[PDB]
Ligand binder design. Structure first.
Ligand code: TYD
Ligand code: TYD
Ligand code: MG
Lengths: 354, 356
């Protein structure tokens, strides 16, 4: 069958959907994936046919409302949910023209969107085909829905709907230990890494003679490796000469790490958990703060109060030196390993149209 | 488990192995794929961790012996198999130092090589882990083995072997109607397309009103220009699939379903793409080791192989493939055979059975 996948504005949204997308293609299905023009290369380099949902940069959707007025940046977790609901909503509305043009000529039998790819809901409803929503991290996929329904109220009304429709199937990748009690029924799925890849160098997959701390933005007897965009790493290399910096495929390097330090990146969190590696979360905005708190409260992470070289250092020492954090992290890895494989989940997609 | 895949010197070899490699990764395994430095970007852009087996291009192994002395190109179909055995043999030998260094730090539990990725056989033997050979086109995977075994004598003797070791498992993608009688036992697999991708434009996945003929010469870095000039008589839309460095790289998996004929140079994976989508094909052989396998597709009735370089030969063959329904009927028959074969996902379980 023909399946349209809809990712969003960031590479993690392509990566999180890639396992199920490639699983469907491996099962003989014809698969297209959509994302903003800037994300198209990430779809293509995941080996997936790529369509642009819009030729506008995401900042257009983030920093201004449907009228063109400035959007006040969120100062709190609660403000962040409403903020995210609205701008993902705006990006979804701006995605519809391109998606109609694609689907008039290549008609999908099913549409799969990520957590906040609301254009998938709209295009499926327009076409009269099942809408599948896949969680693209361990955070609640539905957490921005109220704001998103408001943002898309015009489009939803045109479809005879009062709010965002419930999906025909919710595919969740959140380990049972981390799922909140109010989580809606899901077809569970084992997450696997499918991040951007590079030519591998030995340091990436070889464990060193000292503990290794990976730092990414998406005192201690240890080495620090910086996982960042290559474009950024060039300038970073001048200011910090003797430190590994550049895009390093996280699935490859994380098994060599004692700690993964990140900004609250959902997919980085999954990579660390999956590998059984303790993680340090340093809040840098975003709505994944809450999902990070759950990992910390489970005992497989520490979330620090302040973004400080000082506060981070103490936490790193704790994650390395107290065996419990790695213990809980391996526990989460095992929970992930016990979930239904993407190959099996393709069967649930087939069942929706047969 | 850890699984090392070994591709070769051309993009088609990466693409052919990418379905099983990604099925393995989708199943929780840690998967690395090796190939010559020039192929590393193709591995990376298939979403697979990529290691270089050598820093030399495939042209190096093709055009020179081990001492650097020039070797001529084959002139006959018979010379092709022998010549290919030797250069694949040389490339395998030149891959061993890089593979030894990778596997000392990332030790695979299992090694998967394509049809003529002989370094996979060699490294698996060195490591004492199972070696799996996966056919990377519908041609006989073993067709260059005698010549490769001669080329690899020193390496094989070092391992206490007289010839290339048999795989622990052979994984075949050749549909039944095209398998020769002498074919060995195999775990069958449904081939799926996994070619390089680009941003799609409507013309790639929308067919027009008139028939559509795709022309290609493959993905290895003239004769394309003549093929299009032949098409000029027929009332057909012509699409040219070629390297970027319409005209350009167009993902074959996407556009072939909109075509009525695929015209190509005798490339194994292009043939598979056409057959898989049920599309008749015109094979215009430009050397290589797939020639006779293309003839099988010809003999079955799902293609025509143009005997030689003749003006209007391509044109008349195209006309016959468009207006005689039998070619597409046979092509759809091959498509159905492929679709009945075990999924890459099922094949991962057979790989697992080799180490579990
Ligand atoms: C920076 C970087 C990211 N990645 C991948 C890992 C994750 O799949 C993804 C990051 O997603 P995520 O952690 O959600 O961060 P953000 O959305 O803020 O970018 O990118 C690498 O593989 N290597 C790298 O060097
Ligand atoms: C030139 C070109 C190649 N390809 C892909 C299709 C096949 O998987 C592969 C060609 O492989 P193949 O036909 O075996 O020929 P060769 O070994 O000479 O490259 O490259 C495209 O998808 N689009 C293109 O425009
Ligand atoms: Mg409103």
């Amino acid at each position: 069958m023909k399946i349209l996948f809809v990712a969003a504005g960031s590479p993690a949204t392509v990566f999180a959907l890639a396992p199920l997308a490639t699983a469907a293609r491996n099962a003989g299905h014809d698969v297209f994936m959509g994302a903003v023009e800037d994300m198209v290369p990430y779809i293509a380099s995941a080996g997936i046919p790529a369509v642009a949902t819009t030729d506008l940069p995401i900042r257009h959707f983030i920093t201004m409302d449907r009228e063109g007025n400035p959007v006040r940046m969120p100062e709190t977790p609660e403000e962040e949910l409403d903020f995210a609901g609205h701008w993902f909503g705006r990006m979804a509305a701006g995605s519809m023209d391109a998606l109609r043009e694609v689907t008039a000529n290549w008609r999908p039998d099913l549409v799969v969107g990520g957590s906040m790819s609301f254009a998938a809901a709209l295009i499926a409803a327009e076409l009269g085909v099942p809408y599948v929503r896949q969680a693209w991290d361990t955070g609640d996929a539905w957490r921005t829905d109220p704001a998103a329904s408001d943002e898309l109220r015009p489009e939803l009304r045109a479809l005879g709907l009062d709010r965002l429709p419930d999906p025909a199937l919710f595919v969740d990748i959140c380990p049972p230990s981390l799922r909140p009690a109010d989580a809606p029924p899901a077809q569970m799925m084992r997450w696997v890494p499918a991040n951007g890849q590079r030519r591998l160098e030995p340091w990436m997959y070889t464990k060193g003679n000292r503990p290794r701390i990976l730092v990414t933005s998406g005192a201690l007897d240890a080495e620090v490796v910086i996982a960042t965009l290559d474009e950024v790493a060039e300038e970073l290399r001048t200011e910090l000469p003797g430190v590994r910096a550049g895009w390093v495929p996280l699935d490859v390097v994380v098994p060599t790490c004692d700690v993964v330090v990140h900004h609250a990146g959902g997919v980085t969190a999954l990579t660390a958990m999956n590998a059984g590696v303790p993680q340090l979360i340093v809040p840098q905005g975003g709505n994944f703060v809450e999902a990070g708190l759950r990992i910390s409260d489970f005992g497989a992470a520490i979330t620090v109060d302040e973004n400080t070289p000082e506060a981070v250092e103490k936490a790193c020492g704790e994650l390395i030196g107290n065996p419990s954090y790695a213990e809980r992290a391996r526990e989460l890895s095992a929970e992930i390993a016990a979930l239904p494989l993407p190959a099996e989940v393709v069967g649930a997609l087939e069942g929706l149209v047969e």
